[PDB]
Design a protein around this ligand. Sequence first.
Ligand SMILES: Nc1nc2c(ncn2[C@@H]2O[C@H](COP(=O)(O)OP(=O)(O)O)[C@@H](O)[C@H]2O)c(=O)[nH]1
Length: 488
Amino acid sequence: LSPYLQEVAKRRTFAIISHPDAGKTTITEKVLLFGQITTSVMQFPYHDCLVNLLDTPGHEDFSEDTYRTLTAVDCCLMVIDAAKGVEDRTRKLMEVTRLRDTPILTFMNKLDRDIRDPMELLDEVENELKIGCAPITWPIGCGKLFKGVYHLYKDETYLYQSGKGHTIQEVRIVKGLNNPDLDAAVGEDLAQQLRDELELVKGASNEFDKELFLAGEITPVFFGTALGNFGVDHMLDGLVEWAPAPMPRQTDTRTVEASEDKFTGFVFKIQANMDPKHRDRVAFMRVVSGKYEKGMKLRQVRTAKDVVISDALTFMAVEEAYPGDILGLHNHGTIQIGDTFTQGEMMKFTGIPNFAPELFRRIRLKDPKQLLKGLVQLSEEGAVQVFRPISNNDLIVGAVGVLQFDVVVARLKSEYNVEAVYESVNVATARWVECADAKKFEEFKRKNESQLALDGGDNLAYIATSMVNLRLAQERYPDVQFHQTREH
Ligand SMILES: Nc1nc2c(ncn2[C@@H]2O[C@H](COP(=O)(O)OP(=O)(O)O)[C@@H](O)[C@H]2O)c(=O)[nH]1
């Protein structure tokens, strides 16, 4: 209990992972009224804690930076549409999460409307996402018949009042599971069905365990409706109680704890499109340790220069930050994704990655050609990834979300003189390739040369025609490693 450590102990940093249309926007909004650009990251008080919520843009905004945002959090909330179950992007974002086995909290949403069998929703999570479920609450009816939820550990029933949503409902609680007031509130039909279903839950599901939760191996499961603002506070109570305070982060040199003074942090995201009053392209940095104050002098390790940061975007609940918080650095071409910042100590954080792009095309000028110089530089920042096959001169751009393609053409025109045009190519993914046996490694290069390419950072990567072709290369050259991810 020493003022600075007090501020570290009470912070909780998380982001939502969800499929588009599942309810991130609705539940984020409701989360904020329980706490009483800025949308990027929002800090609010809840109970005795200070909670940092990072946006994970999933619509037209979707990009590789959405994935990288998850590297900068210590906890995620998986929001599932309880009518649709586990969807594609749900699976993709959990995938990203397994890089650090980040703890997950689950919120089954849209209980206003009819849903899939809740026991099946649990099943779906376990068999598809490889994580145990632990129901904390359990729904009592659904649709027009949604009456509320039951807490398995507090032995009580929260009662749902329809048509609230834009306020915080009155909390109404019946205490016994076997209290006849539960039957009077909900009907004996749904009260008996609760009791029978809890029996199946005990027989086929898992008790909550804080240890496994922190190891990324179970998740508490909450049921509610974000539109009607019910059960969101139930999930925030788990968040506060169970999610970690600012966790450590690994470096090339050592493990950095948040309990250290000395400011320390890394950049995980750079805003696409420069608007504000200039080209700020705000670089978002996660504070790993120490306190940022306004006039402070930091070390940009990449360039080995001292930078005074007088203006720094802050997302308060004035102009300070503690570990767990996010900072927006003003950037005019000097910051890059993965840039570490300290107060002199020269080391590099080692979590911030480059994911296998999910979308590809060939870039090309309608002539002639410093287009290469421009893609390599955009690649050094966050903008995109480029691939230069060994056997030819083509340039292949690799994005995660379509938006990135448009951004490259614009920035190529403005910051470099080039006018660039896209062309379809046959590429389904890439994998960075690696082999400690020089003899087997060169035999692999020789026999697969037509599918091999170089990064904008000179890392060798197999460019796969289809996933079937990737599985073939993998199984025929088992001594070679195919990585879906690499350090940026
Ligand atoms: N009935 C019902 N509809 C919801 C609920 N939450 C969100 N919606 C609706 O589902 C749609 C998607 O919501 P949205 O928050 O934009 O999902 P997002 O894409 O993850 O941000 C919208 O038309 C919402 O009105 C829910 O609690 N119950």
